[PDB]
């Protein structure tokens, strides 16, 4: 079994490091004064970057891999996506959900993602997707720790037996309580749904992740209730507000007032760059707003924010390979976090900040933690992001669970020359 | 020498095709009724997609590869970029420009780009970068047909001897006349500069490519003069309006009136997604506009529009590997061209439409044309874009000039499994 990771670079640290492994955990981390020789039981990072696993804080595995079945969304709109999904209803079975969820999970394993939070639609009396996902969670456990959010897609108060189904999902084992206040029939139902959501989370000791204000409506301010209730219950760490795209459209004075509460509450925020840029701003003609939440300002204020892929190869987002560096690339551009340091520190948005959002207790390259880490063939976060590098090795419990042999590019000039896209 | 390309898929066509080569040209193209066996002198596309070479219609090779030298742009702003570039002035020499231009050109060759249009700053009495680029053009000719735009970055009428230097650049061999009307001191200088630009293009029989209305100013309408002058001279095919980001902010009524002229004029448009999303909208707080020209509407109106990378690894854009599928990916998202067909047809924005913009006369997979083509290991444009595939082979004059052995990813579950990110 592997005993050491050598010649490792670490974010924010100078030089090379050696990570000692014992009994599936990191026993010690020591600096090196030079390059160490390879040997049996040593995994050579080759001066590449070693980081804790990538995290997917927000994805919908119940709808993944269904784009084009039976027809393609040709307009690319949300409306048509709903219709295309409805045409596939006859194929939505227990086995179908498991098969598609596993397909995307395999892409995630290949992409060094060892933690995934999936939302599952529970506005279905049969809870078909949920039952399937609970089995998938057990099956994929050796490679990925999967959290399941009971997501009442059609609303809690605006759908028949919505609250009862949400609670049933928790009784069956869902890890997180979801909600969608802006989709409820009225603002009052929206606020009330949040009180019910928090009551359920406290009753069952579960986390909370609300699809919050995902709409270009400057009056959609459910985020203040999410933050206020979290602060009241002293449970900010266990709470997440996903999307909050409406915040992109708030006036600055209200946003400034709100930010004080957001910081005090300690809640987490998830932005989904690939889907937000695609689905937001659809009611604008020109100019067209970007529609991503205030990521830059959150970072400047010390508010925890991270990035999710949201959807992969489905009616609402036809693209994706479940790659977090790709999600990060889109977010840095749309949020204008393009300074060198902002880009370099970007890795935090798909690693540490996301681990905090999932309330993970065993995460990070530190003595005592499980030996879960990945190796990127790049010098730092900036380099990894610029070159969209693959994951050279993914290690879990001190064992390699994924590896990618890099592509080899050659140009034939007066003489053949290898191209690695580095200067 | 290669005699045939077999098992090739072609955009918009059904089945597989065989492309016969003779004397460096495509002699004939015949459909296949099944998979053909490989053999000596046959390049097997392996049911991958064969297309004419990728094109880079807008890049700045004179500033490429300079990010972080001597310092990094930490704010990521245009303003700081100017200051960071100024700090490197002592390193701006003939050899330095050639070295950096060649570095990016090699990345382009590796990425299947055989046609490149580079703008070169000619607001320099010594014309240092231009002299260097003219040598680079000759040196890279076996692999890339490089067009040089004499770009008067500081203005034609607003910079000392600006017009004289622009003409000197043409007398030295620049292929295209550039301009930047919105940067001139006054609207009047802007309009006058365009008359001077067109006069020079007609005097020397050169193409035109204007950095046009690259500013979030709803009153910046120099594009109407570019189109009107082209129509008057009957030279639309030889004219290009780069950027036109101001169009993102025009009212709809004026835009509708303008579009009639744009279509009638026949001029070309270049949008630069990666840089536009980064540099536009910087004077907005929230909401923030996207700032890309009206690509979707141009396509719907039959107006030729294409995508450029603009900058690579410099003070104005720190990222990039000179990859056109990456540029396309960003543009499809920001312009909301996310329907299946829109994404699949996306390849036109980095191939055929760009060739038209460069007024290329030998481009496309057709009998009689030079055997210049590339092979993507994907089923169609949608697949190539989704998976951000590399260029398996780049062929020029019937000879392989670049090749990429794909990365190999394996996940170790109960048994090892190869992952190709296809469903
Ligand atoms: Fe979601
Ligand atoms: Fe430019
Ligand atoms: Mg969604
Ligand atoms: Mg520029």
Curated annotation (Swiss-Prot), chains A, B:
Fe(2+)-CDase is rapidly inactivated by H(2)O(2), whereas Mn(2+)-CDase, Co(2+)-CDase, and Zn(2+)-CDase are not inactivated by H(2)O(2). CDase is also inhibited by excess divalent cations. Phosphonocytosine, a mimic of the tetrahedral reaction intermediate, inhibits the deamination of cytosine with a Ki of 52 nM. It is an enzyme of class 3 (hydrolase). The record marks 243 as: Activates the nucleophilic water. The active site is at 214 (proton donor). It catalyses: cytosine + H2O + H(+) = uracil + NH4(+); isoguanine + H2O + H(+) = xanthine + NH4(+). Fe(2+) binds at residues 58, 60, 211, 310. GO terms for biological process: cytosine catabolic process. Changing residue 310 to A: Less than 0.01% of wild-type enzymatic activity. Its cofactor is Fe(2+); Mn(2+); Zn(2+). Keywords: Cytosine metabolism, Hydrolase, Iron, Metal-binding, Zinc. Pfam families: Amidohydro_3 (PF07969). Its EC number is 3.5.4.1, 3.5.4.-. Cytosine deaminase is being explored for use as a suicide gene for cancer gene therapy. The cytosine deaminase/5-fluorouracil combined therapy has been used successfully for a variety of animal tumor models and is currently under investigation for the treatment of human cancers. Belongs to the metallo-dependent hydrolases superfamily. Cytosine deaminase family. This is Cytosine deaminase. It comes from Escherichia coli (strain K12).
């Amino acid at each position: 079994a592997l005993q050491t990771i050598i010649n490792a670079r670490l974010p924010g640290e100078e030089g090379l490091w050696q990570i000692h492994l014992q009994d599936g955990k990191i026993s010690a981390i020591d600096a090196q004064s030079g390059v160490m020789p390879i040997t049996e039981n040593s995994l050579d990072a080759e001066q590449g970057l070693v980081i804790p696993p990538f995290v997917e804080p927000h994805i919908h595995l119940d709808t993944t891999q269904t784009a084009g079945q039976p027809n393609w969304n040709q307009s690319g709109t949300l409306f048509e996506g709903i219709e295309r999904w409805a045409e596939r209803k006859a194929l939505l079975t227990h086995d179908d959900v498991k098969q598609r969820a596993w397909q995307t999970l395999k892409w995630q394993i290949a992409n060094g993602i060892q933690h995934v939070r999936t939302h599952v639609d529970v506005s279905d009396a049969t809870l078909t997707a949920l039952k399937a996902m609970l089995e998938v969670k057990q099956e994929v456990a050796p490679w990925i720790d999967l959290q399941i959010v009971a997501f009442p897609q059609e609303g809690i108060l605006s759908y028949p037996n919505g609250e009862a189904l949400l609670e049933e999902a928790l009784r069956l084992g869902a890890d997180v309580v979801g909600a969608i206040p802006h989709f409820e029939f009225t603002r009052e139902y929206g606020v009330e749904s949040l009180h019910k959501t928090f009551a359920l989370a406290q009753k069952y000791d579960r986390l909370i992740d609300v699809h919050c204000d995902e709409i270009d409506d400057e009056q959609s301010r459910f985020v203040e209730t999410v933050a206020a209730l979290a602060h009241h219950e002293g449970m900010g760490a266990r709470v997440t507000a996903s999307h909050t795209t409406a915040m992109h459209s708030y006036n600055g004075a209200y946003t400034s007032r709100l930010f004080r509460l957001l910081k005090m509450s300690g809640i987490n925020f998830v932005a989904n760059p690939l889907v937000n840029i695609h689905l937001q701003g659809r009611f604008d003609t020109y100019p067209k707003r970007r529609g991503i939440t205030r990521v830059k300002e959150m970072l400047e204020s010390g508010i925890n924010v991270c990035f999710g892929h949201d959807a992969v190869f489905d009616p609402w987002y036809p693209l994706g390979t479940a790659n977090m560096l790709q999600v990060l690339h889109m977010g840095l551009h749309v949020c204008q976090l393009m300074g060198y340091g902002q880009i370099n520190d970007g890795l935090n948005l798909i690693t540490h900040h996301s681990a905090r959002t999932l309330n993970l207790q065993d995460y990070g390259i530190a003595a005592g933690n499980s030996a879960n880490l990945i190796i990127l063939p790049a010098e730092n976060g900036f380099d990894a992001l610029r070159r969209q590098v693959p994951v050279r090795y993914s290690v879990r419990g001190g064992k390699v669970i994924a590896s990618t042999q890099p592509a080899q590019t050659t140009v034939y000039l007066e003489q053949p020359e290898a191209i690695d896209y580095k200067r």
